[PDB]
Amino acid sequence: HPELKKIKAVLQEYRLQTTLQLSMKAIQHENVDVRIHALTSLKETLYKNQEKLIKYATDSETVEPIISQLVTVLLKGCQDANSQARLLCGECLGELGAIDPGRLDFSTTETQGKDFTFVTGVEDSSFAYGLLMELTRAYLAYADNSRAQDSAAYAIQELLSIYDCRHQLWRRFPEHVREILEPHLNTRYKSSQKSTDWSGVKKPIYLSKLGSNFAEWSASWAGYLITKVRHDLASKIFTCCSIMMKHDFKVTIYLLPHILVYVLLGCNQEDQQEVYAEIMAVLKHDDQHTINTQDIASDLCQLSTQTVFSMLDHLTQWARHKFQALKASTVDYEDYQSVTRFLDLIPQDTLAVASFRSKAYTRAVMHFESFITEKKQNIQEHLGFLQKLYAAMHEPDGVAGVSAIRKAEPSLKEQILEHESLGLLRDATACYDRAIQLEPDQIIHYHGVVKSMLGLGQLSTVITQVNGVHANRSEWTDELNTYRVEAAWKLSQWDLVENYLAADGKSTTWSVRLGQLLLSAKKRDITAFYDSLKLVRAEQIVPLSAASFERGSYQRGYEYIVRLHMLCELEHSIKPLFQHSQEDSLNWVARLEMTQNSYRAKEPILALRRALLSLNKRPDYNEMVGECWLQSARVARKAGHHQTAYNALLNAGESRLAELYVERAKWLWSKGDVHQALIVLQKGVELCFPENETPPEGKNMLIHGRAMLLVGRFMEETANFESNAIMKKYKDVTACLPEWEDGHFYLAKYYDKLMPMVTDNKMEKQGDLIRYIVLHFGRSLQYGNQFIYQSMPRMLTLWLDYGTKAYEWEKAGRSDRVQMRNDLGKINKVITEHTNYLAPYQFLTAFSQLISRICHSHDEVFVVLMEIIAKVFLAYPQQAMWMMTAVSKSSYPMRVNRCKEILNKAIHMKKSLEKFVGDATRLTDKLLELCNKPVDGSSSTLSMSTHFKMLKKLVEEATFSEILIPLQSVMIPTLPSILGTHANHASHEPFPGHWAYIAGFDDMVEILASLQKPKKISLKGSDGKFYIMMCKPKDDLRKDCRLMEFNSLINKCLRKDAESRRRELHIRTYAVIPLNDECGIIEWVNNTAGLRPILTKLYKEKGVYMTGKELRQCMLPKSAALSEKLKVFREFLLPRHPPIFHEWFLRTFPDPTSWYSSRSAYCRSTAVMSMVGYILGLGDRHGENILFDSLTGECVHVDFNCLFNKGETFEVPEIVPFRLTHNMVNGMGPMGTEGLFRRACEVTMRLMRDQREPLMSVLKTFLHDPLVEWSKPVKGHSKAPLNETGEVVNEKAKTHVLDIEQRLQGVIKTRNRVTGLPLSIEGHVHYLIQEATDENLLCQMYLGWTPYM
Amino acid sequence: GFLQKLYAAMHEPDGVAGVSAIRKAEPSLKEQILEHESLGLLRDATACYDRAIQLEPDQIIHYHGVVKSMLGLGQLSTVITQVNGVHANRSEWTDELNTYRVEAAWKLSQWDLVENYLAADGKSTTWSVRLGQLLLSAK
Amino acid sequence: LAELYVERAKWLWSKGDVHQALIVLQKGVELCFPENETPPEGKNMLIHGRAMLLVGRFMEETANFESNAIMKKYKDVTACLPEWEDGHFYLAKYYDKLMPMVTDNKMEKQGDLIRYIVLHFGRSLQYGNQFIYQSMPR
């Protein structure tokens, strides 16, 4: 309202992005009507500030944190009970757009799920409070019925009688709720109804005449059980709720679990059997097969399966904590035995069957996985059921996971299932038609045939196709109409759309709803238009509500959130059509960049965009639809299947565009025939850019630059095109578009490719070449950041290598050194210029590499490196100092001098940096002193105040400059996207998020157990949060920190822009900061413990534990035969170590939905990290270093010291690629490796083979990082760097580079006999997995790796 | 374009491929369909045929190409249902496309559909139709 | 009866996915002609022989299989069908390639390897002529 300015002023007295956070806090408010206004205002804000949010959305690969928190709380709004807000947020999410779930970051916002707080017993206070809540929640609703109100009032008496407090439990009562019991505090009340025996009626209750009603069944069975229980206090508590039960079913819901618990406590054997028979009656009763009254029996079966599931989960948990109490007498033992026998009475397979019937797919999978592994059922018999499960859960990794397990040949129906899950449409329609020929009476087959025909874009043959079966089967005409409708509006034949819509309105399918919206848009019907719009927007929210439960919720519901952005674009593209003045504020060009880079997300958006551009008929709205066809072609050629891409190309060629030819070339290039593609391109370039007419104008110059670049790229594969021809092509590209990263970058790449062969690997003649190289690499960096990981590290490597070679030749006193000296002069001059143009954050990437060369021998090269490092420090001092301080405290004197030099230059360049550095050094100094202090005897805890008084003191000074806690979320850069912010970069923010500062430490200091004892310290952040951190006393972090940077780089590739994101592949990166070469501080991953401790704990619970002397019996000398080693392994270590890890899963994650969506993440995480470890040569993966997130199931790898097959140099060679034993296999599930794991190892390897160039480039610098002690340090008598080099070079650096490149390439080089070595593709994954689970290889591992474990 | 029509009629596909490679201009849709027919590829030919049907609905050549490709793919029952849909859309074109229908029927061994599509169809010289006649009369 | 399996394996090895081809042919040769009881049929014998030979070739294609196992599979192909040109011929060819690596390009050590090669190639030319232009020259 207008007159809020004074109120805004007084609120600011108490106090865009600001407005957004206030709106968020308004959404989080409990009041519905508050939320309504808040969300309306927020939607208007988004529509108004679109062009700013779009900047906030696509500024960088990761959106600003405000947008992430916003989308999280909006997804929380979809769980809101009010329909109005959930629609208003169908609108709230569509306004912002279905951003790429990679561009989001839910880690800080998906921090919910405390769960916990078991309700074990009614006598316990937990159930007391829960039953009070049951006594009130609709006691507010029983005020209309006297006996209902009196009943809960009487139950208040019996509850408050035992639970009166005059007082901590009385305070636990809410003030209003305890006020509700105030009229019945202790005033005695009569019974509200009479007592009727439920045992008199025939059993089972669920079947006959009492079960047929849900609440009636619950009350009747509950009263029967009350007559069956023996705990007298429990009997009273259940009788007082008995009257309560005949009034509402939710009291049965809350108490029936504990009711069955107390039954199992005291009951006869035949009583238990009657109860179990009632359970089986609930389970085997499918509502569809029984013939009786409906609408109460169907919902009865549904809700009854649901409530028996909840109570059985409570029981399952009841038995778990019961075993815990037995670990914590005979009567408790007897209750444990009774509940265990009760649970085992029910067949787990029956549980899974019932859950699948009730659409509880996660419950079904959990119960079935427990079923097969426990009851030892052969898997191949239950296979088809498992495929049905994974197909229902839309988890393709299961289905394609099942096939590899299937021994028998796949049935036709299962062939259809496979073709449906994994999308291979060309082969799918053939399978559908074969099924039809086998079985034409069915309908799902014809549903499929038309479906694939839709995907391939044969739209015209679709509508004609459906009419065929329509004439043959008119009854199939209406459910088949939805496909017919889809093609119609996709064909934009609204007349036929009208015929098909008036033909049937009884279809709700998404395509039909789109068709209705579009028809109403054409024949302008504003009111019915918006009516149907709200209708469909609500329709999409319904499934998005259940999927919004925060377990990677956004990605699972992204398909729907696409539809919400779909509808938002639809709406904002129609309101102009209705008002006519008013134009859409949408930036369609940028609204697509945000969309996930996969066909199953982009294509439906572009389909509707084309439909709307058919509705809106502007003079340019005939090439715009052509451009949209072209864009769908681009995304399809990106997403594999080329047929749809080519069909779109056809539907686009009518538009006159030179981009058409670039896209046709790229598509032909995706097929592989570079020759045909280059031919078509050269033909197109001549057509659209005749050389007699310069195209220096408008979009034409851009398209022509792109086309010329594509020709220059093509020319490099076909070995016919001479070098200088490619040279001229790239030079012409540069001359065309001199403000463009791709041109200069690819030209420099070709330069570096030509260099070593033209100059015969003779560095002296390479000066001018390197000059051109670093000239174009830098200018490339000046206009974009798409390839910075390829360009910048390569540039720096080349320049510093040439400098080192010049220094060396100067000492060789050779003839070439002088011209090479002034050449190096030119090169460092160009580097200086780049330093003057580039932004600092660009150099912030690969900053560890810059530091790795500060001991550079050449002095002036070091001066330029000085000028570089200073610029980064001056702009980002905190993030710089952390990676720096390890060098500051290094043992090498020359390294120390160079670090002092760079710090002195920095403080000379800025003054407050002096205070910052002076504080941080002392801070790192006292932290070092901490890491080095010997443990006080054996006490596991230490008081920092008592021991490290100066440490606590230093942070306590106010003048102590706030130091940023080195978290991996604040040591990793965040580049800007190709578009937007890099049009105005050097102002881009490379660390978006709330920097937390060291405000203090917790006086407690844990000390873990290791050969060298790590010391955990907690850091009280300036925000108030506490982040744990551990000193590693004797390890060289330089290597582990450099590897963690590389893993973060991988996460950059993985998290965004892949199918990998769906599987939520994510390498667990935690900060690793060296404080000294000897001492490092490692960010603690909270909620985790080592694998071996986990399993040992599990084995103890089973009592089985093979002894240490038995271990000594197992170990044999290496000279002993391999076969007998294997026989010892098999016959002793295997049976004394059955696979238990699934028990750990069921324990840590009892909630079935969470259990699955966790274990699924375990397979994915261990697969991804194992794969990264293979192509990294990660070694020494003994069962202690793997350790798992006890909240999500991912695994965190630690102690990366053994790198690049450095386990082969171990006394016991490390044969296996990655730690994958039979126990870890069991945790994956009964499917084993062949399930999600292999499919997760496949996509990771594909992403590796794709991003080879950035990863290989960065790793090349890592392998050349001289700071890490590749070999152990020569003692102080003779420094390994001699104190003159300050560096150590790796002799096996080139061997490591070659081997790693080979592993990425996919050539194994395993057999010294087989030499042809055709590179493998995904059979690489199969070979690796066969290389892990192999018993022969596992056995040769020294028991330190614990292969048995 | 005329040279392409000629080489196509002379059933010399290499000539059509040459006329393709010579074209400095963009091939029109009809020339594209001719090129796909000569090159023999099926899926992309179906794509072009559907593009044409969307462009010219009142055509029997494009529908014939679409159904012939569908028959080539081996989507026999789909071919039959598609021919039936075209029949419902136009009863006058069914006589032209009935040969694909009876070819699929004989292939699918639906002798009932064979005799049915043979009774409705007039005298046709298509090898598929005569083969269906011989096969049915052999049943 | 393994004919569909072998043909699907050939279709895959043609498409380029040699890994899927090898795994499918292995699953086939497992399901049909299981290793518990040999294929007594003379027709099933020829089919299991073609399967063993195709698996040997597919193994030769990829590099993850050890040379000894490939030699063994080819020997099994020679055994289960001792009257097929293919088989003897392909095994001679495999031992032919393996010879330069085994003998380390030392003709002195090549002796018995050359003997085995020539024996297998002659046996191959005996029962057929489909490689009489590739066998007899070598």
Ligand SMILES: C[C@@H]1COCCN1c1cc([C@]2(O)C[C@H]3CC[C@@H](C2)O3)c2cnn(-c3cc[nH]n3)c2n1
């Ligand atoms: C989850 C925790 C805290 O979270 C961060 C990762 N991490 C650990 C944990 C461990 C250990 O549990 C392994 C064994 C058992 C007891 C003791 C500590 O030695 C190590 C070892 N090396 N590293 C290194 C080295 C470089 N980076 N990390 C460790 N990091």
